[PDB]
Design a protein around this ligand. Structure first.
Ligand code: HEM
Ligand code: HEM
Ligand code: HEM
Ligand code: HEM
Lengths: 139, 145, 145, 139
C-alpha cells in the first residue's frame, strides 16, 4: 500500500462520510443477494430487505473499516480482535472476504461516481485486500 | 439460471449501455487493478500509468470487441457454453489465460456498470448480472474443464 | 482426459492404497492445514490439536467414506459428472461447501499419496493423479456451475 | 506464522540439506508436467527431462528458499529483489505460486516420509504461502 494509495483511500472514505453505516448495510445486502451461500454465517439473523439487524451489522463493519482507514500503517494491531473472531470462532472461508470486498467496491462505485476513478478503484481494491489478509492472517 | 424478471432487468439495463466506451473502461480497469494481466497485452503500447492505459486506442478497440462478445452472450443466455466455444479455444489453447482472470474481468465489468448507472444499479440487478458474468466466465473456461 | 498409460499407472498405484487409513489421513490433514474447514465437522468432537484431529474415529470413518467415493470415481473416469451428481447435490444444496475446498482436498490427497509411496510417486504419476482429482472436484462442483 | 512453525520449517529444510537444488529441480519438473500453462513463463528454456537449465533454475529457487528459511523473520527484506523481478518484469499470475508451492510440498512429502507429519505439513504450507505473498506484493 503506497502513500498514493493511502491518500486515495483516505479521500474516498472521507467522501463516504456519515453514510458509512448505510453503505455497509447496502454492501451486506448485495453480498447476501449475489452470493446466498454467505447467508449461512448468519443463521439467527433476519436477512430480509430493510432489516435492522443487517443495518446494525453494516454499521459495525463500516466503523471497523473507518478505524482501518485511520490506522492504515497499523492495521494488524488495529484489527487483532476482529481477526481472532473471524478466523477462530467464526471459521469464515477466506473466499467470502473477496465477495464482501467486491460488494463494498460495487456500493462505492454506485454511490460515488466521480470519486471512482481507475486509480481510486485500484487503491480501494488494495486496501480491502489488505484488510482481508489481516482478518484471515490467523489461519 | 435467471428468472424472467432477472432476464428482463438485465436486458433493460443493457439497452442503455454505451457499446463504445464501457468495454474499454472495463478492460483498462482490469489492466490497472490487476497489473499481471498486462502480460497478455504487451503489443498494445504504453501501459505503465493508469492514464496511459485508459488513453490507449488499442485497449479501447479490444474492449469494444469484448463488450460485443458479452452482448452476444447476453442475447443467448441459454446457450452460453456453445456461444463461447471458439473464444474458449482461443483463450485457453492459444493464450493460456487463467480462468480466474475471467471472473476478475466480470467483476470489473459489474463495477463499471455500477459506476455508470448509480442508484439504478440495484442489488437485484447486480445479482442478476453476477449470475450472467459467472455463466460467461464458466462458458469461457470450459476448455480447461 | 487421461491417456491409456496414465490410466494404467493410476490404477496400478491405487491398487496398493490402504483403503482404511489413506482417506482418514487426507481428511485429517485437510482439517489441520485449512482450519476453516473444521466449520463443517463440529459434530465430530475434538479438533483443537492436530493430534486430536488425526486421532478422531469420526474423522477416520468419514475419510474412509470419502476414499470410497474417490475409488468409485476412479472406476468410472469417463462419467465423473454422472457419478458425483448425488454427492454434488449433498455438498452444494445442503452443506454449502465452497468448491475451492474440493481442490484443496484433492491436493492434500496427492500429498498423502506422495508421502506414502515416495519414489514410486513419479512426476508423471502425479500429473495423472492431478488430472484425476481436478476432474473429481469439477464433477463435485457441478451444482454451482 | 508461529515459533513452532519456524522450528518445524527449519528442521524440515535442514533435513533437506544438500539435496535442495535437486529437490527444487524436481518440483519444477512436477509443476511443468502437472501444470503445462506454467511452461509459457519459460519459453527460451529446454524443459525436457534431465535438462541442465531446469537443474540450474531449481538450484536458484532452492537457494532462495534456503535464504528465506534463514531470514524467516525478515522475508520481505530478504526477498525484495525477487519480488520486484517476479511482479514487475515477469508479471507471473499469482495462481502459479500456489501451483509451485503444491509441487514443492509434494516433492518434500515424497522425499522425507518421516518428516512429513501433519504439523510439519501445516508449517511448510504456511511458510510457502508467506513466501508467495512476499513475492506477489509488488504489482
Ligand atoms: C472487510 C471485511 C469485514 C469486516 C470489516 C468485518 C467486521 C465485523 C465486525 C466489526 C463484526 C462485529 C464484531 C464485534 O461486534 O465484536 C463482525 C462480526 C461478524 N462477521 Fe464480519 N467483517 C468482515 C467480513 C466478514 C465476512 C466476509 C463474513 C461472512 C461471509 C463475516 C461474518 C461475520 C459474522 C457471522 C459475524 C458475527 C456477527 C453476529 O453473530 O452478530 N464477516 N464482522
Ligand atoms: C471474461 C470475458 C472475456 C471475453 C468475453 C473476451 C472476449 C474476447 C474477444 C471477443 C476477443 C477477440 C477474438 C478475436 O478478435 O478473434 C478476445 C481476445 C483476446 N483476449 Fe479475451 N475476453 C475475455 C477475457 C479475457 C481476459 C481476462 C484476458 C487476459 C487476462 C483476455 C485476453 C485476450 C487476448 C490477449 C486476446 C487477443 C487474442 C486474439 O485477438 O486473437 N481475455 N477476447
Ligand atoms: C473433494 C472430494 C470430496 C469427496 C469425494 C467427498 C465425499 C463425501 C462422501 C462420500 C460423503 C458421505 C455422504 C453420505 O454419507 O451420504 C460426504 C459427506 C460430507 N462431506 Fe464430502 N467429499 C469431498 C469434499 C468435501 C469437503 C472439502 C468438505 C468440507 C470442507 C466436505 C464436507 C462434507 C460433510 C460435512 C459431509 C457430511 C454431510 C452428510 O453426510 O450429510 N466434503 N462427502
Ligand atoms: C517459491 C516460489 C519461487 C521462488 C523462490 C522463485 C525464485 C526464483 C529465482 C531465485 C529466480 C532467479 C532470479 C535471479 O537469478 O536473479 C527466479 C526467476 C524466474 N522465476 Fe521464479 N521463483 C518462484 C516462483 C515462480 C513461479 C511460480 C514462476 C512461474 C510459474 C516463476 C518464474 C520465473 C521465471 C520465468 C524466472 C526467470 C528465469 C530466467 O528467465 O532465466 N517463478 N525465480
Amino acid at each position: 500500500l503506497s502513500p498514493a494509495d493511502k491518500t486515495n483511500v483516505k479521500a474516498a472514505w472521507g467522501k463516504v462520510g456519515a453514510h458509512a453505516g448505510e453503505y455497509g448495510a447496502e454492501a451486506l445486502e448485495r453480498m447476501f443477494l449475489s452470493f446466498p451461500t454467505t447467508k449461512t454465517y448468519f443463521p439467527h439473523f433476519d436477512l430480509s430487505h430493510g432489516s435492522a439487524q443487517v443495518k446494525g451489522h453494516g454499521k459495525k463493519v463500516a466503523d471497523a473499516l473507518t478505524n482501518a482507514v485511520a490506522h492504515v500503517d497499523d492495521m494488524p494491531n488495529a484489527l487483532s480482535a476482529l481477526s481472532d473472531l473471524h478466523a477462530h470462532k467464526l471459521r469464515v472461508d477466506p473466499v467470502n472476504f473477496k465477495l464482501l470486498s467486491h460488494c463494498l467496491l460495487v456500493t462505492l462505485a454506485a454511490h460515488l461516481p466521480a470519486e471512482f476513478t481507475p486509480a481510486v478503484h485500484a487503491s480501494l481494491d488494495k486496501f480491502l485486500a489488505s484488510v482481508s489478509t489481516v482478518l484471515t492472517s490467523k489461519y | 439460471h435467471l428468472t424472467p424478471e432477472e432476464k428482463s432487468a438485465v436486458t433493460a439495463l443493457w439497452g442503455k449501455v454505451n457499446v463504445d466506451e464501457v468495454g474499454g473502461e472495463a478492460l483498462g480497469r482490469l489492466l490497472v487493478v490487476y497489473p499481471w494481466t498486462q502480460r497478455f497485452f504487451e503489443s498494445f503500447g504504453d501501459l505503465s500509468t493508469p492514464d496511459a492505459v485508459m488513453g490507449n486506442p488499442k485497449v479501447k478497440a479490444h474492449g469494444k470487441k469484448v463488450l460485443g462478445a458479452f452482448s452476444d452472450g447476453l442475447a443467448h443466455l441459454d446457450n452460453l457454453k456453445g456461444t463461447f466455444a471458439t473464444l474458449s479455444e482461443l483463450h485457453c489453447d492459444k493464450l493460456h489465460v487463467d480462468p480466474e482472470n475471467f471472473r476478475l474481468l466480470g467483476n470489473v465489468l459489474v463495477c463499471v456498470l455500477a459506476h455508470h448507472f448509480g442508484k439504478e444499479f440495484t442489488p437485484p440487478v447486480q445479482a442478476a448480472y453476477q449470475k450472467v458474468v459467472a455463466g460467461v466466465a464458466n462458458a469461457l473456461a470450459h476448455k480447461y474443464h
